[PDB]
Write a protein that binds this DNA or RNA. Sequence first.
DNA 1: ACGCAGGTCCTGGAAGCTAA
DNA 2: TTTAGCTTCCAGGACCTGCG
Length: 112
Amino acid sequence: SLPECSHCHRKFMDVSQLKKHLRTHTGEKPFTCEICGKSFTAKSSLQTHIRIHRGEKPYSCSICGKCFSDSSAKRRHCILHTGKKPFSCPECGLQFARLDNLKAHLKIHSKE
DNA sequence: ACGCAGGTCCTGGAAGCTAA
DNA sequence: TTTAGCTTCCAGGACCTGCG
Ligand SMILES: [Zn+2]
Ligand SMILES: [Zn+2]
Ligand SMILES: [Zn+2]
Ligand SMILES: [Zn+2]
C-alpha cells in the first residue's frame, strides 16, 4: 500500500516522494537559479546547474582525466573506455555505444 | 553526411535525517 | 525510542547540440 498518485496511479516510497512527483503533472519548478533566473524541478538539479556558472568540475575520469560538472556526463563518458556497443540496429546491424545515437540512426532508415 | 560524444536537465529510487 | 515523512544524494535517461 505505497502512496499512489491520483493522476497516473503510480506508487512511490513515501508521501514526500509522491509530493515531489506531483510536479511532473503540473510543471511547477520551485528551485530558481539566482544567477540566470532559470527554474528547476528539484534542488539537486539546481545545485548541478550552479556548478556550470562557477566552472566547478569535481567529476573527473579515472582513465583519461577528463573533468565534468555533471556526474552523469562523467559516468556516461567513462563507459567509452570499455568499447562496448550493446545497441544494434534492427535493420542494418550498425552497433552503437549509446541508445540516443541509434534512435537518431533509425530516423535515416525511416526516411530511407 | 552522419556517427560520435558532450551539454543540460528531468525522473525516481537509495540513503540519510528530523521531528512527530 | 520509534518511525513517518522529510531532505539529500545518486544513477539513469531524454533531448539537444556541435564537431570531425
Ligand atoms: Zn502522477
Ligand atoms: Zn543559472
Ligand atoms: Zn576518460
Ligand atoms: Zn541501421
